[PDB]
Design a protein around this nucleic acid. Structure first.
Ligand SMILES: [Zn+2]
Ligand SMILES: [Zn+2]
Lengths: 128, 142, 140, 81, 101
RNA sequence: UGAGUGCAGGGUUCUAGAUCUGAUACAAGUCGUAACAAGGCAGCUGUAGGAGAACCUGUAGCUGGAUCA
RNA sequence: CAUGAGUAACUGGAGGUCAAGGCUGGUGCCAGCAUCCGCGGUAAUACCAGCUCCAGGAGUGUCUAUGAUGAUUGCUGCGAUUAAAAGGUCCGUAGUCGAAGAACAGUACUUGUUUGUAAUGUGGCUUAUCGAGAGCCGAAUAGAACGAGAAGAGUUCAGAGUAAGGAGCGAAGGAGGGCUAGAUUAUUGAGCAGCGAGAGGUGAAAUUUGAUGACCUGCUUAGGAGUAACAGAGGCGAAAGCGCUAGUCAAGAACGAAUCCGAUGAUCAAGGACGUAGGCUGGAGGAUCGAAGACGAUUAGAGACCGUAGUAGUUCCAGCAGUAAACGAUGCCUACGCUGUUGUGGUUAUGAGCACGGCAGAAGAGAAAUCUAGUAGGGCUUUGGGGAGAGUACGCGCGCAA
């Protein structure tokens, strides 16, 4: 079976390239919800509905014009606060915009919040 | 996909969204519970119990009335078999293939099918003898 | 092999791959100390035993002047090249010469000279360049 | 979102496979069949795996097939669940 | 480089096929690759039908025909000129040939 | 507690050897011409015989074929 | 501080890479030069010298190890249709990797405080004419002690039941396999009858066979192989492979649907089973075809190609062996993905679907040809690293040998 967080990313990336505005995503987990909810806070996606089908789960989402790309990293590497900027420079296009998402004892947070809260964690994914 | 061959079939049957109580039916709870335990004592497998309840007595999925599953009811009544019914059906097919090959020794296709069947037996055995459903030194009837 | 707890499998695989590199292989598994000049020494002393000449490879047309040297440190006998214009005239039989490498990665032939792997540097303790250009004289 | 994607038309529902939908659909249902002549009522399942005979008169009322089962020529039915 | 998408033969979803023998040289060729030719030939030539009309005892007569399917290997088909070499765009055109007589 | 030294064996690394047999380089020597064009018997892979030498012949396969028919 | 004075550059280069001369004289594939590419056969900006330029400069050339060049070792970050490169097919242990929902616990994980670094190195300031130097300051790696947070990972549960798996039910489909009993012709061989001179074979002919009656036409028989036409970009099987008709024996794939159990799963060193043909050990048999061997022709020569003939093999039973251009030259699970058309088997609100295919464009991709090749840090195994020598030597394991 495919990784659920990988499946999420390819589904939205392809649909964006094909110039569609909305998609249905077919297998959902707890961190998939939290990832989508992160993209909504930063205004990359607009509307979210979750379907409680008793068979795994599924979501319907509206895409914005601001989303260029997103992706998951596998495996989920452990990082000290000293390490995160290395990954930031590898993944993101510019020092000015975009988000690298990290899981922590305080939920999902971005590479700026890591400095504010003074915490590393595990690397999860990115979008710009 | 399938475990022993290159199959990718998709024929299944849909489970309902909610289950309710089958008010259209023409028997009580206690009658349905009696019908099950009779069919059990006569020696029918629990998958066949389900088929009869649907087909003749008119109850879907056999749980909406009882709030309990078929195999659990048989354990409450004490009618539990010595071997789980899945492992039991695998030993039967092995015996059949060995009885064919015993008289038609030349059949390379049947030889092929036996080694597949035998592998599946031990994979199932190792499941049950971890959940304490079989004695540790159980061995096939062969 | 890309799993988070896969480090042992990954390490053992990647180590085995390196033997496909000629460089790593020779250092590991070949005879790297067989040569007069190489891993062992930058220069080698030896005594001249015969004077010799060899044809250049095609398409060039020449006779190249060469010397048979007995190497003190190994007791092998080897061929060496004598570089300069009138150079062969500066050497007698039973002279001592110091000998040097041609500058390739492994010991390999250079230019049009087939199968010769070293060149003369000094004769009787003095620079061959100075001898040929008449800047200095034989010790006598 | 699009209305077309979140709320399909009933036409679209009926063209899709029973699993490949936003919510999966049950296709089997129960019916009350009445026998020609004796007018007794029997509960039956559509898609029956077993042949069924009328209570009392023992006329074969329903025949099992590879798909949806076949009601005998004269008989009639109503959906109950 | 690969010259044809179908490898020059009609086999798909199979391992192996029956062989047949070439009419001209008896070489073995796979059935799904062999060049095929159909023939329907009158027993009596056209230049005799006007004599047949006075020779026959019957009120009317229908001449018997003879039927054949012939098989050829590539070398023979090219040499006998059943098929010819064609340009890179023509190679893709597929059309049924006439039955011979 | 034991150095030294007898006598048999092993384990390693080097080296000699009548004679045989590989490889590589041979300006251009001798005999043919096997491959590349339908290369003058279309070529190639496995296997088995045979033969101055390239190679030839039977059997099953492949098109990278001279045919997408 | 005071006295004299007027001394003080070389190494490598100048055809391209690579800064800087078609200058003058010698030499004529010689002598030499050249990391690489290349110069010289009498008109050499490349040899040997003169003269002018260039580069660095108290320094500059060469040889040898190593780091970089190098995404040519690839964690970040390469490749495997045709350039080097996916195991012939399955089973399978160690190993690496593994649903949704509701809850729980703190050893990894991350972080605080405290320990843990003289020199060196790092961030600074101060004094030797200046600059290295010297002197003083601050923080620090890995490792350990005690607390904290709980997203991910982990453990459990069942009024939960995967477009995860296995068991089972119903109607049906197929050259899938083993066994038993039958079949229409055809090719050879014998018997007998009719006839009375040639048959065969080739591009053209000769070996060869015929008055002991050939050839061709009848009737009888004896064997051992095979299933024509229908027959296809049709079907079935793990692959190798499977085509006459009945009867019989096991298991499998797909489809329909409100059946049952509940994580039983993916991939796989070692280990085990199958594997066209040709080959080998023993038995049965022997029609046709035909390696070896023998002739007739053709040629300078044919040992070959062609023709006549002929043996092992080619068939069956019981085994060994283990290779193929075993190829769609494209590993296995699992995803996301445009349209039109044509098949095969079930089901159908007759609108369509599900499994297995063929074909034609598009968009992307790619060195192109083209597309099993589009998108992508999903999981696991095999595998390549300029030609040659070489898939060869030595050792070892299997095999009767090959
Ligand atoms: Zn009735
Ligand atoms: Zn032919």
């Amino acid at each position: 079976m495919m990784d659920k967080l990988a499946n999420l990313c390819i589904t939205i990336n392809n649909a964006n390239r094909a110039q569609k505005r909305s998609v249905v995503i077919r297998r959902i987990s707890k961190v998939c919800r939290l990832f989508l909810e992160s993209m909504q806070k930063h205004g990359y996606i607009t509307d979210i509905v979750y379907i409680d089908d008793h068979r795994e789960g599924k979501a319907v989402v509206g895409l914005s014009g601001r989303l260029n790309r997103c992706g998951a990293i596998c495996p989920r590497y452990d990082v000290e606060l000293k390490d995160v900027e290395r990954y930031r420079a590898n993944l993101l296009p510019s020092r000015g915009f975009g988000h690298l998402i990290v899981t922590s004892s305080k939920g999902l947070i971005d590479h700026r919040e890591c400095i504010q809260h003074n915490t590393g964690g595990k690397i999860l994914g990115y979008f710009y | 996909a399938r475990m022993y061959s290159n199959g990718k079939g998709q024929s299944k049957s849909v489970t309902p969204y909610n289950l309710t109580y089958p008010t259209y039916i023409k028997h009580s709870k206690e009658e349905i519970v009696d019908v099950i335990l009779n069919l059990a004592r006569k020696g029918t497998p629990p998958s066949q119990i389900g088929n009869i309840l649907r087909d003749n007595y008119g109850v879907g999925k056999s749980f909406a009335v009882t709030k309990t599953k078929i195999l659990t009811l048989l354990k409450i009544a004490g009618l539990k078999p010595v071997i789980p019914e899945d492992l039991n059906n695998i030993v039967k097919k092995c015996v059949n293939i060995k009885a064919h090959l015993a008289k038609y020794t030349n059949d390379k296709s049947s030889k092929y099918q036996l080694i597949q069947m035998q592998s599946c037996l031990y994979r199932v055995a190792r499941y049950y003898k971890s959940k304490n459903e079989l004695p540790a030194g159980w061995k096939p009837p062969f | 092999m890309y799993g988070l707890l896969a480090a042992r499998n990954l390490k053992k695989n990647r180590h085995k791959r390196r033997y496909a590199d000629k460089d790593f292989a020779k250092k590991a598994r070949g005879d790297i100390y067989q040569n007069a000049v190489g891993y062992s020494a930058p220069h080698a002393k030896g005594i001249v035993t015969e004077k010799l000449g060899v044809e250049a490879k095609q398409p060039n047309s020449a006779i190249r002047k060469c010397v048979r040297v007995h190497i003190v440190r190994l007791n092998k006998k080897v061929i060496a090249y004598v570089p300069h214009d009138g150079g062969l005239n500066q050497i007698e039989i039973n002279d001592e010469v110091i000998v040097e490498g041609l500058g390739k990665k492994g010991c390999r032939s250079k230019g049009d000279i087939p199968g010769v792997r070293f060149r003369v540097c000094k004769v009787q303790k003095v620079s061959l360049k100075a001898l040929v250009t008449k800047k200095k004289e034989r010790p006598a | 979102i699009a209305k077309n994607l979140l709320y399909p038309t009933v036409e679209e529902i009926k063209k899709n496979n029973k699993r490949k939908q936003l919510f999966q659909e049950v296709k089997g249902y129960f019916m009350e069949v009445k026998c020609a002549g004796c007018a007794t009522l029997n509960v039956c399942y559509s898609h029956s795996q077993k042949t069924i005979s009328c209570k009392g008169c023992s006329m074969v009322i329903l025949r099992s097939t590879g798909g949806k089962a076949k009601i005998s020529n004269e008989c009639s039915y109503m959906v109950i669940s | 480089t690969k010259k044809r998408s179908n490898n020059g033969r009609s086999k798909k979803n199979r391992g192996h096929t029956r062989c047949v023998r070439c009419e001209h040289c008896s070489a073995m060729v796979p059935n799904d690759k062999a060049i095929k030719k159909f023939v329907v030939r009158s027993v009596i030539d056209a230049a005799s039908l006007d004599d047949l009309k006075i020779a026959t005892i019957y009120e009317e007569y229908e001449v018997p025909k003879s039927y054949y399917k012939l098989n050829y290997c590539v070398s023979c088909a090219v040499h006998i000129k059943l098929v010819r070499v064609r340009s890179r765009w023509e190679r893709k055109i597929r059309k049924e040939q006439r039955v011979s007589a």
